[PDB]
Design a protein around this ligand. Structure first.
Ligand SMILES: Nc1ncnc2c1ncn2[C@@H]1O[C@H](COP(=O)(O)OP(=O)(O)OP(O)(O)=S)[C@@H](O)[C@H]1O
Lengths: 398, 63, 127, 69, 127
């Protein structure tokens, strides 16, 4: 077997890597007790040179591997044209691991096991790379598609992937680059100038790829915009946008397929209206669906123990997870009532997009309760009314 | 007035052969500063010599 | 005298790296001291003091701060040597002051990974 | 000896000069080892006229004179 | 004489900065201050900046470890795109000539760090 451990090193901490590894291994072997995360330490060095330690899926086993990472402080660099520096490309450039991305991989909650599939995909990619397999004989396009309902966190999973991969695979690539492509600023449309513009940003991608000691992730938002369905569209009125801008990207991406330290990640909204010659050039086209009842309950939990962690809900009552309610078998009791009422909200708040789910506490603490400090079961009631407030508001805008 | 970091207008020192420590200059800053010293304790033996008491001497000598 | 003071700073820096089996007794300045045989370290400390040498040719100097680092390079200990720079017992008296200092106090992990500093015979330790 | 003064606000050993009051460069040495290394060195190109003064191709000239002072 | 050859290097560095348009702030204007027909900077912060950079290479240049004064013009990545290299092997005749040199040297050509590895100024420029 194997288990993974990740430890936040402070930027103002500068001790050597192997000392950090030895110290964390010492803490683990002394403690050696589930998936909980350490925050409390007992060594002045380790305190001033560590922020937290965490286990990612209660056992005293010693099959432990350490990944140590530094979330880079500064945000995005910008990419503009070479001689038309005003606005032509304007691509976003994250130098991973990055600060604004942490905690993101944990918060997201799905029910189709996208995380494991879409992570061990890259793991098997590296395995086949190091074993020297005949790239002429077994190959992959290094393109992963994610499509589904709007606001359901489709694109969130790609930044989480990139963060988790530049963290997990440290000391195998010093760092990673993540290029966020704006598929709306590359449509300067007068007689195939956009189809010529894709070329420049892809040469810059080549520039960031040849640095063979950096793992690069190219994240394309709205991959339906760049690749419009040319065949079924019975519109000859499309002069050269539907034929000389999709064909200007189906080549530059078949050109980076030969390299190995690149991965293409794409986010789509419309399943149709996309070129059939691009739904073959993607290894994984995984569908991100709207949250389901258990998922909704887990997200609502995350929110509520987040509020309790910041003391918003001052009287701390144990919120019982759905597994404990199944174990007891749905028995009403003086503490078990709150979880039950949460679960009734979960069925009643079914079918909403994850973004409004992660908003709903904001509104429920906005209009219905002005209290700077709130007791539970009134805040819960505020949620149970704010959800119906959201249904009626959606019905209001027709 | 000047401090050197053999790793105020500061004259650091680099010795390019050693250059594993990816971030050097911030390491160099730490080495310079002062920080709270503990007092140099004026020391005292705890069990002093009382002249009214006489110690023990065995007879034998080395060959 | 600056040259022989720099050789005594050699004696200091490295014997205090001692004050384990990779170290050995040998005759330095007519006393036996248990240092290291490392020729790379020998010439490296010689280089430290001989780059300190033009520094003392300037004659403007305050301390020779032989910082005994921890393994973190973030001082949990230190050894400031504030000699107010303008027979064998006294050339050994300095070594006995530092030994009694590390006596009442304590050392650091085996590899002290120390980085000599200078601020341009007496001493103390910021622990 | 090589003397890499990172600054101007917007074998061989290295006597770099730190001289800090900011403590936030986070990269002197690699940029110092960047400024130290020689990079693709373009050869010194040579100068030459491309339109010489032809004795068979002669210039134009307007009439009037400037206001003298 | 190096106490005024440092100011000659001052002349050099600011004129390179000036002709390269490394900044759009046109602060530079003709300055014969103390009868020197050279075009320095009007930032006393930067005049004293060159002054003390050359001050801290004064225990460092005429010691003659110097193998080339490489006034790098840095880049957006802080890259030596144009290493204006000056060989240290040393009367206005050179000065204007160097001035001349620089200009005619920028003839072919199209953030500065003063690294110090016939004043044969040559430019190692990106191809
Ligand atoms: N399924 C989910 N589970 C938990 N959190 C979610 C989920 N989906 C979305 N979120 C939250 O939604 C916020 C942003 O989601 P987005 O990824 O921007 O949605 P999105 O899918 O990008 O929609 P598009 O395609 O860009 S309209 C993040 O803060 C996520 O935490």
């Amino acid at each position: 077997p194997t288990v993974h451990v990740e430890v936040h090193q402070r930027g103002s901490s500068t001790a050597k890597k192997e000392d950090i590894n030895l110290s964390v291994r010492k803490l683990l072997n002394r403690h050696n007790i589930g998936d909980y995360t350490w925050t409390e330490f007992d060594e002045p060095f380790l305190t001033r040179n560590v922020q937290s330690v965490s286990i990612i899926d209660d056992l005293s086993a010693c099959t432990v591997a350490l990944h140590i990472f530094q979330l880079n402080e500064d945000g995005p660099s910008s990419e503009n044209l070479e001689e038309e520096t005003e606005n032509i490309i304007a691509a976003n450039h994250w130098v991973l691991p990055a600060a604004e991305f942490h905690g993101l991989w944990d918060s997201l909650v799905y029910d189709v096991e996208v995380k494991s599939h879409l992570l061990d995909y890259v793991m098997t990619t590296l395995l086949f790379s190091d074993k020297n397999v005949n790239s002429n004989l077994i190959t992959w396009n290094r393109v992963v598609l994610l499509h589904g309902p709007p606001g359901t966190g489709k694109t969130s999973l790609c930044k989480a992937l990139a963060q988790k991969l530049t963290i997990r695979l440290s000391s195998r690539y010093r760092y990673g680059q993540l290029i966020e492509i704006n598929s709306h600023s590359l449509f300067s449309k007068w007689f195939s100038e956009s189809g010529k513009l894709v070329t420049k940003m892809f040469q810059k991608i080549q520039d960031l790829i040849d640095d063979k000691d950096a793992l690069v992730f190219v994240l394309i938002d709205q991959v339906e915009s760049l690749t419009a369905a040319r065949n079924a569209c019975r519109a000859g009125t499309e002069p050269s946008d539907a034929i000389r801008v999709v064909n200007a990207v189906l080549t530059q991406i078949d050109q980076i397929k030969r390299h190995s330290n690149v991965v293409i990640l794409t986010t789509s909204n419309i399943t149709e209206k996309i070129d059939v010659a691009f739904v073959d050039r993607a290894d994984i086209k995984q569908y991100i669906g709207p949250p389901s009842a258990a998922a909704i309950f887990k997200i609502y939990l995350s929110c509520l123990e987040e509020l309790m962690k910041c003391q918003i809900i001052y009287p701390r009552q144990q919120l019982l997870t759905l597994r404990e309610l199944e174990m007891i078998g749905f028995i009403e009791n003086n503490v078990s009532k709150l979880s039950l009422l949460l679960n009734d909200i979960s069925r009643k708040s079914e079918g909403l997009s994850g973004r409004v789910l992660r908003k709903l506490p904001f509104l429920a603490h906005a209009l219905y309760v002005q209290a700077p400090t709130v007791t539970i079961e009134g805040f819960l009631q505020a949620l149970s009314l704010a959800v119906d407030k959201q249904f009626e508001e959606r019905k209001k805008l027709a | 007035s000047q401090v050197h970091i053999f790793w105020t207008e500061v004259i650091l020192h680099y010795r390019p052969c050693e250059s594993d420590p990816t971030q050097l200059p911030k390491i160099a800053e730490k080495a310079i500063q002062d920080f709270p010293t503990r007092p140099l304790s004026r020391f005292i033996p705890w069990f002093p010599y009382d002249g009214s008491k006489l110690p023990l001497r065995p007879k034998r000598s080395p060959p | 005298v600056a040259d022989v003071l720099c050789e005594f700073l050699e004696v200091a820096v490295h014997l205090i790296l001692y004050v384990v089996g990779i170290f050995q007794k040998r005759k330095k300045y007519n006393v036996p001291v248990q240092m290291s045989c490392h020729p790379e370290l020998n010439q490296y400390i010689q280089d430290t003091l001989h780059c300190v040498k033009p520094l003392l040719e300037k004659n403007d100097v305050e301390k020779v701060v032989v910082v005994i680092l921890d393994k973190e390079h973030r001082p949990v200990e230190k050894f400031v040597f504030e000699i107010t720079q303008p027979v064998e017992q006294l050339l050994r008296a300095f070594i006995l002051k530092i030994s009694v200092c590390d006596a009442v106090l304590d050392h650091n992990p085996p590899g002290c990974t120390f980085t000599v500093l200078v601020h341009t015979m007496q001493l103390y330790v910021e622990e």
